[PDB]
């Protein structure tokens, strides 16, 4: 489970130098339920 400050760290590890994306969320998909690297790379910039 990636919750709270852990989720930011995990998305930073996954994003690298790509950066995040902009323009019922990330908490439910990764805090309440198990999440993997296969569905956390889709929050990064294309």
């Amino acid at each position: 489970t990636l919750c709270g400050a852990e989720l930011v760290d995990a998305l930073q590890f996954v994003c690298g130098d790509r950066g995040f994306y902009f323009n019922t969320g990330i908490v439910d998909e990764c805090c309440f339920r198990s999440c993997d690297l296969r569905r956390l790379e889709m929050y990064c910039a294309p």
Partner: protein, 581 residues
């Protein structure tokens, strides 16, 4: 005995009924004298029944308006066995108006039951009776709302043994001229004026020591003396006397021309036990093939509020109705319930628990196999639980095998019942997924069970403190674990009960993507033993405790609400700022 044997009688309004006791020595029943309103002490000055030695079930006096002292009515009534009680009581005296002296100075033992002398307006001389030398458990007796509530009498104390039952030495007396015979422990057999103990097969009082024939009371009774076991040609009867000559035949023929009678195990009993039948000739039970369990309920229900309600089901195996266990008062009735209603295996109806304050376990149903739902509770329930403060266990579910054929269960306001025990039955009882049940907030809210195990890891004790350290525990959400709390009790004796017991809090450790969250506990006296364990505090939409480990030296719930707010904004912020492609 200076007289014959009496049936139990209820003495009603007029005093002409009480004269039947004149030629009486044994009442193998109960004695009730009741509701004689138009009487004065001039009607009781010269009315005495001195030849009463034996009462077997219970004595109750209620609303006597003339009696002020029992020293004349029953001067040497020596024992009340307690075969049949009166709502867990063998001696009840209630609302006696002009009664002030209890009398009954010669009463020796009550083998089974308690005593309730309550709401007697003029009564005193009560604090001078040591009931430990009369009955077994004083903690079950209830004397309350007597004259001692407001004004204390001046006890004569005529000058008699004194023992520390209260906080200090106090003399124990009955009347203005009598007191309690506290026989030394060398003799239940009792001792006479010179101190010589009585025969082993007798209790209370004896004329000449070491003689079965010289006894008035005795723990069975042969025709002439009292013996440990009735002789071969005499069978037991009414748990008190040995009669064989023509008794069981005469009662059996009298009943036909009520309770029938039979002979079994050298003991005359009203009905053959389970699995036994009547050969109609010898009056002996014989083992009979074909399952023949014992009990019809005329009302269709039975509220087990006391022992006398449970005793009606003694030897019962099948109930043709519903049981409503409705015990009140907090008295430890667990021992007596199993003896009476423990052989019950099959119930034809629902089983209900309400306001059972005392009950801590329902295991007294030692052989409860099947709860048939025929004639079910209105509401479609076949097992119930409501307002049971001290219920923390239903069954030892590693061994018991229960079956239910009908509707679901209800559970409300069981503050000390862990939900693990409740949910465990649904898998084992056999009612999975067949509903047409449970209140989470009111089950175990006072004695919350911690499901997980928090094993210790390190122990470092010293001359004035101790060092503890346990393995980390983190829920699925690390934010859920609010913190820790540590308990000690410094109990000298091992095997201390679960949750002195001082509470003190500890903050969680940082995760560091672990550090042992133990505590540098201080303030221990240089030698004494200590008993400690740690337990987690968490928020819920889980929870662990350490076993009680033993070692010797060498309105405030808004914080939970505040924590939920802290999670809500951080959750809200993450949901908005992170968007998938």
């Amino acid at each position: 005995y200076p007289g014959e044997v009496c049936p139990g009688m209820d003495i009603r309004n007029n005093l002409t009924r009480l004269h039947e006791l004149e030629n009486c020595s044994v009442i193998e029943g109960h004695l009730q004298i009741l509701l004689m309103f138009k009487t004065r002490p001039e009607d009781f000055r010269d009315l005495s029944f001195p030849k009463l030695i034996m009462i077997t079930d219970y004595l109750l006096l209620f609303r006597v308006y003339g009696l002020e002292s029992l020293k004349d009515l029953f001067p040497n009534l020596t024992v009340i066995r307690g075969s049949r009680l009166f709502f867990n009581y063998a001696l009840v005296i209630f609302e006696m108006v002009h009664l002030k002296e209890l009398g009954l100075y010669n009463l020796m033992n009550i083998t089974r039951g308690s005593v309730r002398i309550e709401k007697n307006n003029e009564l005193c001389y009560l604090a001078t009776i040591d009931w430990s030398r009369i009955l077994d458990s004083v903690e079950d007796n209830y004397i309350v709302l007597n004259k001692d509530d407001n004004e204390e009498c001046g006890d004569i104390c005529p000058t008699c043994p004194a023992t520390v039952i209260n906080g200090q030495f106090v003399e124990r007396c009955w009347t203005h001229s009598h007191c309690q015979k506290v026989c030394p422990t060398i003799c239940s057999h009792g001792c006479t004026a010179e101190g010589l103990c009585c025969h082993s097969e007798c209790l209370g009082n004896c004329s000449q020591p070491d003689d079965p024939t010289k006894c008035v009371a005795c723990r069975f009774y042969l025709d002439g003396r009292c013996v440990e076991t009735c002789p071969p040609p005499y069978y037991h009867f009414q748990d008190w006397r040995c009669v064989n000559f023509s008794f069981c035949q005469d009662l059996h023929h009298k009943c036909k021309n009520c309770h029938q009678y039979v002979i079994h195990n050298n003991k005359c009993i009203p009905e053959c036990p389970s699995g036994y039948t009547m050969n109609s000739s010898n009056l002996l039970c014989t083992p009979c093939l074909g399952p023949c369990p014992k009990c019809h309920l005329l009302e269709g229900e039975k509220t087990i509020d006391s022992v006398t309600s449970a005793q009606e089901l003694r030897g019962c195996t099948v109930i043709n109705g519903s049981l409503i266990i409705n015990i009140r008062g907090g008295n430890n009735l667990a021992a007596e319930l199993e003896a009476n209603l423990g052989l019950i295996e099959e119930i034809s109806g629902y089983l209900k628990i309400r306001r059972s304050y005392a009950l801590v376990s329902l295991s007294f149903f030692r052989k409860l196999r099947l709860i048939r739902g025929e004639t079910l509770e209105i509401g479609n329930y076949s097992f119930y639980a409501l307002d049971n403060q001290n219920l923390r266990q239903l069954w030892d579910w590693s061994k018991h095998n229960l079956t239910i054929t009908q509707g679901k269960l209800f559970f409300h306001y069981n503050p000390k019942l862990c939900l693990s025990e409740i949910h465990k039955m649904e898998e084992v009882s056999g009612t999975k997924g067949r509903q047409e049940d449970i209140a989470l907030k009111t089950n175990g809210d006072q004695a919350s069970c911690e499901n997980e195990l928090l094993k210790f890891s390190y122990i470092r004790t010293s001359f004035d403190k101790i060092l503890l350290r346990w393995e980390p525990y983190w829920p699925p959400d690390f934010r859920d674990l609010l913190g820790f709390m540590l308990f000690y009790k410094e109990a000298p004796y091992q095997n201390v009960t679960e949750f002195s017991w001082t509470v003190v809090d500890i903050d969680p450790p940082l995760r560091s993507n672990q550090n042992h969250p133990g505590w540098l506990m201080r303030g221990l006296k240089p030698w004494t033993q200590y008993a400690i364990f740690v337990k987690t505090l968490v928020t819920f939409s889980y929870g662990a405790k350490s076993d009680i480990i033993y070692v010797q030296t060498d309105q405030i719930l808004k914080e939970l609400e505040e924590s939920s707010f802290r999670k809500t904004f951080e959750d809200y912020l993450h949901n908005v700022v992170f968007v998938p492609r």
